[PDB]
Amino acid sequence: CGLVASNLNLKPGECLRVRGEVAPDAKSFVLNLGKDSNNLCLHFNPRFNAHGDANTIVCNSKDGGAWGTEQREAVFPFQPGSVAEVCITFDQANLTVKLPDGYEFKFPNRLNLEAINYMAADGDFKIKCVAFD
Amino acid sequence: CGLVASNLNLKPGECLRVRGEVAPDAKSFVLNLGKDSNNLCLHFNPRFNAHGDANTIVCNSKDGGAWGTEQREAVFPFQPGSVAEVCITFDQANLTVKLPDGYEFKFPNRLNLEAINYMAADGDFKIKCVAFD
Numbered sequence: 001c002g003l004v005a006s007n008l009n010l011k012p013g014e015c016l017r018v019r020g021e022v023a024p025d026a027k028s029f030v031l032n033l034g035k036d037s038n039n040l041c042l043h044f045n046p047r048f049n050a051h052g053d054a055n056t057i058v059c060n061s062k063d064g065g066a067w068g069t070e071q072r073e074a075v076f077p078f079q080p081g082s083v084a085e086v087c088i089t090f091d092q093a094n095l096t097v098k099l100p101d102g103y104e105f106k107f108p109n110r111l112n113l114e115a116i117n118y119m120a121a122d123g124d125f126k127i128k129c130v131a132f133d
Numbered sequence: 134c135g136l137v138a139s140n141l142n143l144k145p146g147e148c149l150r151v152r153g154e155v156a157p158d159a160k161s162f163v164l165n166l167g168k169d170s171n172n173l174c175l176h177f178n179p180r181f182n183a184h185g186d187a188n189t190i191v192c193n194s195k196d197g198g199a200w201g202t203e204q205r206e207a208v209f210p211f212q213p214g215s216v217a218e219v220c221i222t223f224d225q226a227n228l229t230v231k232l233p234d235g236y237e238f239k240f241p242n243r244l245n246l247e248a249i250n251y252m253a254a255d256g257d258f259k260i261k262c263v264a265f266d
């Protein structure tokens with residue numbers, strides 16, 4: 001398992017920056033943000049080659065242990081064997097995920113969290129730096 | 134309390150860099166490093182004015198929940214209401230703590246830890262950035 005951080009107290013409008021190395025043979029990696037492992041306002045899962053998906057960003061939420069409705073994006077600004085930075089902010093309506101190569105997208109904030117306190121990384125992504133503005 | 138991080142997977146010789154904000158009314162702050170909350174190879178407690186200490190860094194270990202013997206350092210390159218970076222590395226014998234303004238000291242690796250997987254901050258120090266070299 002990857003880096004797990006709690007007590008982040010990330011408030012609306014604040015920016016969470018995560019930079020890591022994508023494994024040369026990476027198949028997928030995960031960044032989870034929320035209250036705890038059962039309450040995720042963002043499950044961010046770029047799949048290079050996993051679950052039959054190729055170069056697809058899979059996003060979902062988890063509310064009291066229940067996965068929400070999966071959504072998929074249409075751009076994949078990740079390459080195996082390279083450094084990638086992911087930058088995330090949220091308000092009550094949406095999380096805004098900013099990725100390399102200028103790409104940005106929004107994911108509905110389906111939970112009722114006053115602040116993002118929990119982050120967990122998994123998969124083929126070696127965290128090198130985490131910043132809270 | 135402050136930020137808590139697990140699964141750090143910090144190995145001997147690797148450098149953990151922590152940048153944060155010392156509160157303007159700082160009396161004391163803490164950075165704990167170890168295997169988990171009950172097994173700390175470093176309890177790093179700069180005291181501006183707390184527990185009878187003035188401008189003194191107090192270090193200790195915790196072994197299966199039992200505090201070790203405190204060690205008091207000779208330098209204190211910290212100021213209230215400022216940004217400070219601490220950089221930690223370790224090996225079989227010692228942790229090396231590098232401080233602002235070129236100061237550093239060593240603290241024995243009392244638990245003989247070969248990996249640091251846990252970090253926690255408390256007190257008047259808001260972590261803004263954590264990097265792994």
Ligand SMILES: C=CCO[C@@H]1O[C@H](CO)[C@@H](O[C@@H]2O[C@H](CO)[C@H](O)[C@H](OCc3cn(Cc4cccc(C=CCN=C(N)N)c4)nn3)[C@H]2O)[C@H](O)[C@H]1NC(C)=O
Pocket residue numbers: 001023028029030043045051058059060067070122123124125
């Ligand atoms: C016709 C519809 C088919 O229906 C499918 O149904 C599956 C199960 O419901 C979904 O799959 C699930 O989708 C969820 C989001 O919705 C989560 O992603 C979940 O994973 C949870 C999870 C697992 N993990 C561990 C982990 C994750 C990534 C890498 C590693 C690695 C590595 C070893 N390497 C290292 N250490 N370097 C480990 N974390 N979170 C995933 O299984 C599919 O998407 C979905 N597909 C579609 C098209 O709808």
Ligand SMILES: C=CCO[C@@H]1O[C@H](CO)[C@@H](O[C@@H]2O[C@H](CO)[C@H](O)[C@H](OCc3cn(Cc4cccc(C=CCN=C(N)N)c4)nn3)[C@H]2O)[C@H](O)[C@H]1NC(C)=O
Pocket residue numbers: 134156161162163176178184185186191192193200203255256257258
């Ligand atoms: C009894 C008379 C004299 O004898 C003293 O006896 C004390 C208790 O045994 C020792 O003190 C203890 O020493 C330990 C190391 O060995 C730990 O440091 C421990 O603290 C554990 C601890 C507490 N915490 C939370 C925390 C720590 C610092 C600041 C804040 C907070 C807040 C509010 N501000 C915000 N939010 N901005 C919160 N973390 N670790 C500390 O109490 C003193 O050294 C010792 N002094 C001397 C000179 O002998």
